[PDB]
Structure 1
Amino acid sequence: AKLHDYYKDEVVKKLMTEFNYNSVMQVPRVEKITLNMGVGEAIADKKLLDNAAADLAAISGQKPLITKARKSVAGFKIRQGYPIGCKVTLRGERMWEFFERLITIAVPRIRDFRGLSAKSFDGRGNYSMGVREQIIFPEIDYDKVDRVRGLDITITTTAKSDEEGRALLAAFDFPFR
């Protein structure tokens, strides 16, 4: 909605003026945004993962997919095909509105916020931040709360470098201490 049209004017025009792009297709596009909740303590009871799924469904607009374990590990008492994590991959306009609520509303509420350090890019412009407790989104009632139950949001941009993706996310006024 808002951040899409603000992108389509200002971000493409500024990454045009300060990065040498003969074509507009070279400008990095934030493509998808996934919220992952690596619950993990549902080796004992899966009531907890069942609550965490509805917590993610309240945060985003999509019903989250439950992720079963890939290989069996006896270090953490997990079994093959045990549902141990939860995820949402949200792309398109719903991702744009989640990006609205993340920047304009959510990141002021991280409760002694000092600015997300920009060195969390992995090598090709994809960002990853970790939200430590779930109540930073105002969709949670906070009269109901049970556990802290954080998550991590990773943003996939089509940038190839860290500086191009950093300038892309900084063009949408990321905090960036």
Structure 2
Amino acid sequence: AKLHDYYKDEVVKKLMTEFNYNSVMQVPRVEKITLNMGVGEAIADKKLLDNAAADLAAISGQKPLITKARKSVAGFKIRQGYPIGCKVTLRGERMWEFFERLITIAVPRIRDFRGLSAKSFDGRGNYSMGVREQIIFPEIDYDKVDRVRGLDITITTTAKSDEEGRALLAAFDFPFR
């Protein structure tokens, strides 16, 4: 709500001005945010998965659901039904506050900040990349760190093209490529 009001005040207006849209809701609208952890090392130890799920629940406003295996392959030695990871389906005030807290402090202070990529898209304007070094987030303190771990960050939007994603990045001011 706190960031949603400012979003509707300025981002919607600037996107409409730059894209000369006619429909009131032609501006892209955020659907949800997904925070998944596809480490793949859950086979060796199961406690790390629980610790990471607890950390995700603490940093977010909800407890992530566990995801089971999709397809078994003999090369990687993976069975069926064995839990591997979990994801957080951020929606509503929780997603708004989490995104605000991220974009406020967490994004600028990252080692080797080369800038986000504006071309890497799924194909319909959904930005689904991955970020390593989970220590960058403020909630993960040195008390609860276990190992250098990575995460996958995905933002879901009603948009169906990469131009809308570029417009959203421009609204987010897109520091550098």
Whole-angstrom CA distance in 2 between matches of 1:9 and 1:89: 26
| Alpha carbons of structure 1 residues 55 and 75: separation in structure 2 relative to 1, 3 Å | farther
TM-superposed CA distance for 1:45, in Å, is: 2.1
Whole-angstrom CA distance in 2 between matches of 1:142 and 1:120: 32
Secondary structure of 1:119's aligned partner: coil
Secondary structure of 2:72's aligned partner: coil
Whole-angstrom CA distance in 2 between matches of 1:74 and 1:3: 47
TM-superposed CA distance for 1:112, in Å, is: 2.2
TM-superposed CA distance for 1:99, in Å, is: 1.0
Q: Deviations over 1:73-127 (max 9, x none)?
A: 2222211010011111111121111110111111012112121111122211111
Checking the alignment, whether the CA contact within 8 Å between 1:170 and 1:176 is kept in structure 2 is no
Whole-angstrom CA distance in 2 between matches of 1:176 and 1:122: 20
Checking the alignment, whether the CA contact within 8 Å between 1:36 and 1:86 is kept in structure 2 is yes
Most deviating of 167-176 and 107-116 = 167-176
Relative to its length, the structure with more strand (as a share) is 1
| Alpha carbons of structure 1 residues 93 and 144: separation in structure 2 relative to 1, 3 Å | closer
| Alpha carbons of structure 1 residues 92 and 176: separation in structure 2 relative to 1, 3 Å | farther
| Alpha carbons of structure 1 residues 2 and 174: separation in structure 2 relative to 1, 3 Å | farther
Q: Which runs of 4+ in 1 moved over 2 A?
A: 172-176
Unaligned runs of 5+ in 2: none
Secondary structure of 1:125's aligned partner: coil
RMSD over aligned Cα atoms:
1.4
| Alpha carbons of structure 1 residues 169 and 92: separation in structure 2 relative to 1, 3 Å | farther
Q: Percent identity?
A: 100
Unaligned runs of 5+ in 1: none
TM-superposed CA distance for 1:7, in Å, is: 1.2
Most deviating of 29-38 and 114-123 = 114-123
Secondary structure of 1:15's aligned partner: helix
| Equivalent position of 2:35 in the other structure | 35
| Equivalent position of 1:158 in the other structure | 158
Secondary structure of 1:33's aligned partner: strand
